Symmetry: C6
Subunit: 90 residues, 6 copies
């Protein structure tokens, strides 16, 4: 199933992105990843058109957070199931 992710610098902005993503389309929040250097990603799963709508809303909400910084965003439509048991996206 399709995967969407928004990476911010800072925790409060990632939470806003995570809230705005789930409220914007039929997606479920499945993942929260921390890789250091203040870089934090939230991950959603769903239909690709729904994930597109969630990520769109997630980005513009996280941008408006006080001291919020979006670092990177990305969507994959049909990720290989090999990723699912190696990377924390589910």
């Amino acid at each position: 199933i399709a995967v969407g992710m928004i990476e911010t610098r800072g925790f409060p902005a990632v939470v806003e992105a995570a809230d705005s993503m789930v409220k914007a389309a039929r997606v479920t929040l499945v993942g929260y990843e921390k890789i250091g250097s203040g870089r934090v990603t939230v991950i959603v799963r769903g239909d690709v058109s729904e994930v597109q709508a969630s990520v769109s809303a997630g980005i513009e909400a996280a941008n408006r957070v006080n001291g919020g910084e979006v670092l990177s965003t990305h969507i994959i439509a049909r990720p290989h199931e090999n990723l699912e048991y190696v990377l924390p996206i589910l």
Copy 2:
């Protein structure tokens, strides 16, 4: 229920924010998150108007801490319960 969060650079300032937030309104401190790079967030839950009063007081106290730096602050009024079992806000 509503969520409020203040992210500082440095530990002592996050503790002051956490103390000033709980003392400023009917909220309960539920979370302390560390994402690296000296970035640390404390999280409170309560009624949105109470969370607004706590966050307001939390910010101006943390700012007055010696070597204190507030990085980002944010309030969500009715976060989706999907966040609660993925992100450490409860």
Copy 3:
């Protein structure tokens, strides 16, 4: 067996690299390593010519990720089995 790895700055770009690598050749994703400072590597195993095709595709996909940054890439054709029980490449 041959090992290929792509290191990015940021999580979403590493996931794209990991997806693009597995979809580009007969390789299996075996590893995801985090060393701090936003530096994250995904690792694939397979035949050397297949790993070359995967890494090639992995790099140009990760480069096109919004806010994606490839830091370092490398392929070893017949790594010593001593590495396999010390480093997380399998």
Copy 4:
């Protein structure tokens, strides 16, 4: 009970602060927190006037450490007990 904390950049300077704090007043060292980026805090508890005397001595000792850097210092006199079970200050 009152809480005092000194955050340094570097480990040896935090240990000197921790030693100088306990030797300067009736306080007990209860906490050592690491938040990344070389930022490290030691925490003492006691009477507020005692904590003031400890923190005063802690700061000027840590400053004289070779390559020592104090980042932030702070004292709370009667922190809310809500903090005690969320933050590592006891």
Copy 5:
């Protein structure tokens, strides 16, 4: 027994150093240490002249890795056994 170590910035370059070290002399890879800030070290043990040959080959291979950076290298010929149970070199 003698210890050799190469520290790189980045994971793929440390793996190349680790592979090139074991393939260059009678040494065994025993250690992989992560200290943050992208700084990563691989450690080999063996005869000092063998460790010298491995480290020599490890360095020039890691240097040729795409985006590879060697930060620090060092050899000790007869380290004290006190180190062995405190530091992860065995």
Copy 6:
């Protein structure tokens, strides 16, 4: 008992400091602490005059490590036993 500590930037240089300290006086290596940002400390215990001799030798050896950087050094002669059960110096 007296405590001595040398903090370096990088792992190989901390190991050299740890080896040079134990070989320079009647001290025992007891601790290895990692606080992020490449900052790493080794800690020795012993008589204060012995710790002085070890730290002296530890510093000039770590300085001569290829890419070695000493960040901070410090000695306490009679640290309070309160530190021993809060900080990893024993």
